[PDB]
RNA sequence: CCGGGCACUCUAACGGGACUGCCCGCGAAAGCGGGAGGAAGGAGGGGACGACGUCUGGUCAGCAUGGCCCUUACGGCCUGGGCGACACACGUGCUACAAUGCCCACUACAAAGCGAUGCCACCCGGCAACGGGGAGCUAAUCGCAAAAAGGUGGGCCCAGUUCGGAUUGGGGUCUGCAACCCGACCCCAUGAAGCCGGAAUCGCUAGUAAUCGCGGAUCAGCCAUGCCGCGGUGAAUACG
């Protein structure tokens, strides 16, 4: 969930981007 | 998960005091207030007394510890 | 030739243009069902027409902006209801009782200070 | 502790600002720090003139300004010898080169800031508080005003136990956002310590 | 405000980091609003006096 | 089949199944099925001996896994520990190592709460 | 509610069966204001009932509700030191509130993985006269009268 | 094509600078595009009322920056005069990107 | 997108608008109960605003201030520590224990805000953090910007498990003179407790609760899960 750093919703919550949530 | 980037940091207080002290060879003791500085190759063999805020702890530097900051051998707090 | 209302809800603006025709409904250049894809509520948006036997005697071009889809659905609900009266003011005699003419005033209440969410107060202990 | 400053509360209507100069997120803090430096000096000296207000307008290095006093002369000086030194004291403070008009306070007993200053002085000279208050309310109430009130803090009369003397007449509706009530606060150092003085004058409603 | 630690105006921090806002009016160092240079307390004091132009009491 | 040291992922998608290996996670899993071209969705029970070989081949020679990994990691900790190193001491004292508050919740590294007598009057709240 | 008498708020009829009673059940099913998801669940249920049953789901829904309504219940009241379970009638309004609430609660106690199946099967076992819902209804009524000795404390 | 930008803190101080520029130009230039509103930019300052603790009080303050546009087409020389030195507002700032 | 037009939507100034006025019923009156028009009734909904006073309440560490005390140190400058300690106890919260769910795709619909020594479109390199390079913006023109929940599709099948992400090993990117004590952020490993919580106890009456995400102040960076705001979806129940 929101606490999973390396996941979709995880990056959102932590307000970041990366492999699991790229900037499109 | 350590980090610093490209440009290993080391205060030049002891640096120009060590690499320079390597001219005659080695020496007994040193006294620094730079926990900040990284331990580099040219220190192995030296005995750098580090300050922990109250004391100047004598830290013998070895090969296996090249890379760690000096503060890591001068523990700040005192528990039991 | 063409009739038009408006309708707004919870901060959703709806531009409703009714023109005689089949029963096609365009919402932002999209089939009604295209925009409100799988939203059980949607059906509602056109309730006013059915409230007077229109729908199968009209066609509608709809614009929308601001808010969320269900809010937009409520706005559209009013536009269609308004224009449907500009068309024939005798239609109020039926849409009134169903309150289709009313603009729901309910809006997100302001977030007060010292209070997690406007009303939800902080939990306290050892009192 | 309750009740907002009746001025900060009435800025919307019945009560304009004391600095009508616009600015942007880069200079505002400066033009502000400036006004204060201004009021800092103006008050540090013109005390004797009895300065009720001090507006400050701007447009671009042409810092309008003004100073509403009860006794203009004190500002001016022999022909204008004081209003000179000071006028240069402004541009020496801030190389802005600005005006320095002077409005006269028709009645110094309808300007809360003065009425406060008034009583505040008496307190230091050791006048009986209750009297001063009673009186002050009168001066204000006699020369017009649909209402008025005065409040002194504590250690009244050098007492160890801080108190709070009252006194007020007519109307002073603070909850009514339209009262147009001048508020004035005057400190009051003393051998034994500070005493705060607030003054309220209700003049005209709508 | 310990009129000695009001050496913030120093501008010679050796390293731009050590630079810290600090109130211009109180010396208050813990709630200094960039925009006003004031602390939350004085920012509230002057605003009441109408001495902060434009600054009104918000309500909605 | 057994890929890494006696590993037996089975009856479940190979990618998921590969996870049951010490050293492999969603990433290295998906990656190996990639560089070995095997549909991840296939149940290992439906894998091919041909495939099971390429997998076994790749994975085993390309990464330090299972026991060999624990050995290394074991080693590491013991190193910063054999050295004066602050980080080492923390490991010895069994306390957090990544600079965390030990005044409260530090349970995961400490274990169960070994409660002791306290000072009643003085709302410890 | 110390002043007025908080009047019951009316709900918007069903977007399908045009039934208020249905929106209600949907509201109970709904969690975290996800009224869409709520709606779908209920409907797939009316569908699953169409399947295993050659009867209109709306009629099954009703029947079910009816069987889970408690016409009597016990209410606690302190009198003379101790508290006594006083049985008393149950207003129509509360019966409905209770019936629907229990259906969803009982349904979510069920073993089927899919939400829709649960409401469906619970709704059926309900109109049949069985199911966890109807039990609650019965365990309640059994509770009442089982204390008829105190029925004179009308309340 | 005269671009006129009016900003301020008072919405009368600006409307009193969009009037001293709306008629004093309709006698030398285009029929002019009336003063155009333009959304405001509000800046909120939320402060804890008291000096010590009591973090649940707080009062709300704000700086509302109103805007105006105007935009008079056809400089016409004669317009650039009726609007040369004929204003009044002190709590205003003007901009021209014609 | 261009011509072109202010209709519409907005933007934002100024006005209109609701008065128990109108109708029936009760009443001495005030007013109560309905009914009609109306976007809106009978305080429309939410703020700002909190009397004489009480707690001898908070705050001399925001400031101001009487007295008292130190005035080569109870002042001052640095470097390094500390405020981050950890057997243990409590408060407020965060993330969870999962299928009305979690993933990955792909597609929608916000509102208020912020943006020179800055937002940073777009392009290239890098799994990525981020680094090169650069368009436009002193912003209703450009940018932060994707809103998320939803919707379509597909995977997982009920397991401490595609639930949950705590710890810990490793490799890095940034901000900064400098990240040991003591920074966020990325990637690979690791994958803890937790299967819904004893006695107790908290919030909330509707766009409220619950739930979803977005922006701000402070600020280099950040330990924001705090705080102050914004909008999406949107209940239950109140006998008494
Ligand atoms: K109102
Ligand atoms: K006291
Ligand atoms: K959640
Ligand atoms: Mg997960
Ligand atoms: Mg729907
Ligand atoms: Mg909300
Ligand atoms: Mg001081
Ligand atoms: Mg700083
Ligand atoms: Mg500042
Ligand atoms: Mg694994
Ligand atoms: Mg610690
Ligand atoms: Mg009032
Ligand atoms: Mg106390
Ligand atoms: Mg006390
Ligand atoms: Mg602390
Ligand atoms: Mg807790
Ligand atoms: Mg790339
Ligand atoms: Mg377990
Ligand atoms: Mg897992
Ligand atoms: Mg650090
Ligand atoms: Mg389970
Ligand atoms: Mg925020
Ligand atoms: Mg920040
Ligand atoms: Mg930390
Ligand atoms: Mg944060
Ligand atoms: Zn201050």
Swiss-Prot record, chain A:
Pfam families: Thx. Residues 1-24 are annotated as: Disordered. One of its GO terms (molecular function) is rRNA binding. It comes from the Bacteria. InterPro entries: Ribosomal_bTHX, Ribosomal_bTHX/bTHXc/bTHXm. Residues 1-12 have a biased composition (Basic residues). GO terms for cellular component: ribonucleoprotein complex; ribosome. Keywords: Ribonucleoprotein, Ribosomal protein, RNA-binding, rRNA-binding. Part of the 30S ribosomal subunit. Binds at the top of the head of the 30S subunit. It stabilizes a number of different RNA elements and thus is important for subunit structure. Belongs to the bacterial ribosomal protein bTHX family. This is Small ribosomal subunit protein bTHX. It comes from Thermus thermophilus (strain ATCC 27634 / DSM 579 / HB8).
From Swiss-Prot, chain B:
The gene is rpsS. GO terms for molecular function: rRNA binding; structural constituent of ribosome. Coiled coil: none annotated. GO terms for biological process: ribosomal small subunit assembly; translation. NCBIfam families: rpsS_bact. GO terms for cellular component: cytoplasm; small ribosomal subunit. HAMAP family: Ribosomal_uS19. Located at the top of the head of the 30S subunit, extending towards the 50S subunit, which it may contact in the 70S complex. Contacts several RNA helices of the 16S rRNA. Belongs to the universal ribosomal protein uS19 family. It comes from Thermus thermophilus (strain ATCC 27634 / DSM 579 / HB8). The keyword rRNA-binding applies. It holds the Pfam family Ribosomal_S19. Keywords: Ribonucleoprotein, Ribosomal protein, RNA-binding, rRNA-binding. This is Small ribosomal subunit protein uS19. Part of the 30S ribosomal subunit. Forms a loose dimer with protein S13. InterPro entries: Ribosomal_uS19, Ribosomal_uS19_bac-type, Ribosomal_uS19_CS, Ribosomal_uS19_SF.
Curated annotation (Swiss-Prot), chain D:
InterPro entries: KH_dom, KH_dom-like_a/b, KH_dom_type_2, KH_sf_prok-type, Ribosomal_S3_C_sf, Ribosomal_uS3_bac-typ, Ribosomal_uS3_C, Ribosomal_uS3_CS. Keywords: Ribonucleoprotein, Ribosomal protein, RNA-binding, rRNA-binding. Gene3D superfamilies: 3.30.300.20, Ribosomal protein S3, C-terminal domain. It comes from the Bacteria. Residues 38-106 form the KH type-2 domain. It holds the Pfam family KH_2. GO terms for cellular component: cytosolic small ribosomal subunit. GO terms for molecular function: mRNA binding; rRNA binding; structural constituent of ribosome. GO terms for biological process: translation. Belongs to the universal ribosomal protein uS3 family. HAMAP family: Ribosomal_uS3_B. Binds the lower part of the 30S subunit head. Binds mRNA in the 70S ribosome, positioning it for translation. Part of the 30S ribosomal subunit. Forms a tight complex with proteins S10 and S14. This is Small ribosomal subunit protein uS3. It comes from Thermus thermophilus (strain ATCC 27634 / DSM 579 / HB8).
From Swiss-Prot, chain F:
Residues 94-125 are annotated as: Disordered. GO terms for molecular function: rRNA binding; structural constituent of ribosome; tRNA binding. InterPro entries: Rbsml_uS13_C (IPR027437), Ribosomal_uS13 (IPR001892), Ribosomal_uS13-like_H2TH (IPR010979), Ribosomal_uS13_bac-type (IPR019980), Ribosomal_uS13_CS (IPR018269). Pfam families: Ribosomal_S13. One of its GO terms (biological process) is translation. Keywords: Ribonucleoprotein, Ribosomal protein, RNA-binding, rRNA-binding, tRNA-binding. SUPFAM superfamilies: S13-like H2TH domain. The keyword Ribosomal protein applies. GO terms for cellular component: cytosol; small ribosomal subunit. Located at the top of the head of the 30S subunit, it contacts several helices of the 16S rRNA. In the 70S ribosome structure it contacts the 23S rRNA (bridge B1a) and protein L5 of the 50S subunit (bridge B1b), connecting the top of the two subunits; these bridges are in contact with the A site and P site tRNAs respectively and are implicated in movement during ribosome translocation. Separately contacts the tRNAs in the A and P sites. Belongs to the universal ribosomal protein uS13 family. Part of the 30S ribosomal subunit. Forms a loose heterodimer with protein S19. Forms two bridges to the 50S subunit in the 70S ribosome, contacting protein L5 and the 23S rRNA; these bridges are straddled by the 5S rRNA. This is Small ribosomal subunit protein uS13. It comes from Thermus thermophilus (strain ATCC 27634 / DSM 579 / HB8). The lineage of its organism: Bacteria, Thermotogati, Deinococcota, Deinococci, Thermales.
């Amino acid at each position: 969930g929101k606490g999973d750093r390396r996941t979709r919703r995880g990056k959102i919550w932590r307000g970041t981007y990366g492999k699991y949530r790229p900037r499109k | 998960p350590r980090s610093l980037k490209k440009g290993v940091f080391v205060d030049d207080h002891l640096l120009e005091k060590v690499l320079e002290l390597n001219a005659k060879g080695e020496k007994r003791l040193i006294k620094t207030w730079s926990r900040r500085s990284t331990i580099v190759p040219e220190m192995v063999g030296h005995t750098i007394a580090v300050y922990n805020g109250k004391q100047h702890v004598p830290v013998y530097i070895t090969e296996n510890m090249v890379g760690h900051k000096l503060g890591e051998f001068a523990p700040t707090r005192t528990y039991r | 030739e063409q009739y038009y209302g408006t309708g707004r809800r919870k901060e959703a603006v709806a531009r409703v243009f009714l023109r005689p025709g089949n029963g096609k409904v365009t919402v932002n250049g999209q089939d009604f069902n295209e925009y409100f894809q799988g939203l059980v509520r949607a059906v509602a948006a056109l309730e006013p027409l059915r409230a007077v036997d229109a729908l199968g005697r009209f066609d509608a071009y709809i614009t929308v902006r601001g808010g969320g889809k269900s809010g937009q659905i409520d706005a559209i609900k009013l536009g269609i209801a308004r224009a449907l009266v500009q068309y024939n003011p005798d239609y109020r005699a039926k849409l009134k009782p169903l309150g289709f003419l009313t603009r729901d005033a309910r809006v997100v209440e302001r977030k007060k200070y010292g209070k997690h969410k406007a009303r939800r107060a902080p939990q306290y202990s050892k009192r | 502790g309750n009740k907002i400053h009746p001025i900060g509360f009435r800025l919307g209507i019945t009560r304009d600002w004391e600095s009508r100069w616009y600015a942007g997120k880069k200079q505002y803090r400066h033009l502000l720090l400036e006004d204060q430096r201004i009021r800092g000096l103006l008050e540090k000296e013109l005390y004797s003139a009895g300065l009720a207000r001090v507006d400050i307008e701007r447009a671009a290095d042409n810092v309008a300004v003004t100073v509403h006093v009860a006794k203009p002369g004190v500002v001016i000086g022999r022909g204008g010898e004081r209003i000179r030194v000071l006028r240069e004291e402004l541009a020496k403070l801030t190389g802005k080169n600005v005006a320095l008009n002077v409005q006269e306070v028709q009645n110094p007993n309808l300007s809360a800031p003065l009425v406060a200053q008034r009583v505040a002085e008496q307190i230091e000279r050791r006048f009986a508080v209750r009297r001063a208050i009673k009186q002050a309310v009168q001066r204000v109430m006699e020369s017009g005003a649909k209402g008025a009130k005065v409040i002194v803090s504590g250690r009244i009369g050098g007492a160890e136990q801080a108190r709070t003397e009252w006194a007020a007449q007519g109307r002073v509706p603070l909850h009514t956002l339209r009262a147009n009530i001048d508020y004035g606060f005057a400190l009051a150092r003393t051998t034994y310590g500070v005493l705060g003085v607030k003054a309220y004058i209700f003049l005209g409603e709508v | 405000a310990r009129k000695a630690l009001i050496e913030k105006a120093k501008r010679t921090p050796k390293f731009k980091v050590r630079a810290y806002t600090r109130c211009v009016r109180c010396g208050r160092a813990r709630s200094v609003y960039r925009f006003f240079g004031l602390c939350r307390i004085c920012l509230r004091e002057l605003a009441h006096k109408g001495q902060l132009p434009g600054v009104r009491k918000a309500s909605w | 089949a057994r890929i890494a040291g006696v590993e037996i992922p089975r009856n479940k998608r190979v990618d998921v199944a590969l996870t049951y290996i010490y050293g492999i996670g969603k990433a290295r899993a998906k990656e190996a099925l990639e560089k070995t071209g095997i549909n991840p969705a296939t149940r290992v029970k439906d894998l091919t001996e041909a495939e099971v070989v390429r997998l076994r081949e790749y994975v085993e020679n390309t990464w330090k896994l299972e026991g060999e990994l624990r050995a290394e990691v074991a080693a590491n900790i013991k190193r910063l520990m054999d050295i004066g190193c602050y980080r080492g001491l923390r490991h010895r004292r069994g306390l957090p190592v990544r600079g965390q508050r030990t005044r409260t919740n530090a349970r995961t590294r400490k274990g169960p709460r070994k409660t002791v007598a306290g000072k009643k009057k003085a709302p410890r709240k | 509610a110390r002043r007025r008498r908080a009047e019951v708020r009316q709900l918007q009829p069903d977007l399908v069966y045009g039934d208020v009673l249905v929106t209600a059940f949907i509201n109970k099913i709904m969690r975290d204001g996800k009224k869409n998801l709520a709606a779908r669940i209920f409907y797939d249920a009316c569908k699953i009932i169409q399947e295993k049953t050659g009867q209109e789901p709306l009629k099954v829904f009703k029947q079910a509700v009816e069987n889970v309504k408690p016409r009597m219940e016990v209410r606690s009241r302190r009198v003379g030191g101790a508290n006594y379970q006083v049985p008393m009638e149950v207003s129509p309004r509360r019966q409905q509130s209770l019936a629907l609430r229990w259906l969803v609660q009982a349904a979510n106690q069920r073993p089927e993985r899919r939400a829709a199946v649960r409401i469906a099967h619970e709704l059926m076992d309900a109109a049949e006269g069985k199911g966890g819902a109807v039990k609650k209804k019965e365990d309640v009524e059994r509770m009442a009268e089982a204390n008829r000795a105190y029925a004179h404390y009308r309340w | 094509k005269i671009r006129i930008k009016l900003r301020g803190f008072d919405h009368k101080t600006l409307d009193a600078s969009a009037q001293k520029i709306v008629e004093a130009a309709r006698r030398s230039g285009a029929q002019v595009s009336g003063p155009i509103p333009l959304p405001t930019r509000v800046r909120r300052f939320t402060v804890i009322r008291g000096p010590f603790k009591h973090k649940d009080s707080r009062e709300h303050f704000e700086l509302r920056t109103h805007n105006r546009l105007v935009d008079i087409i056809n400089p016409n020389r004669k317009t650039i005069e009726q609007l040369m030195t004929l204003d009044l507002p002190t709590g205003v700032e003007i901009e021209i990107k014609t």
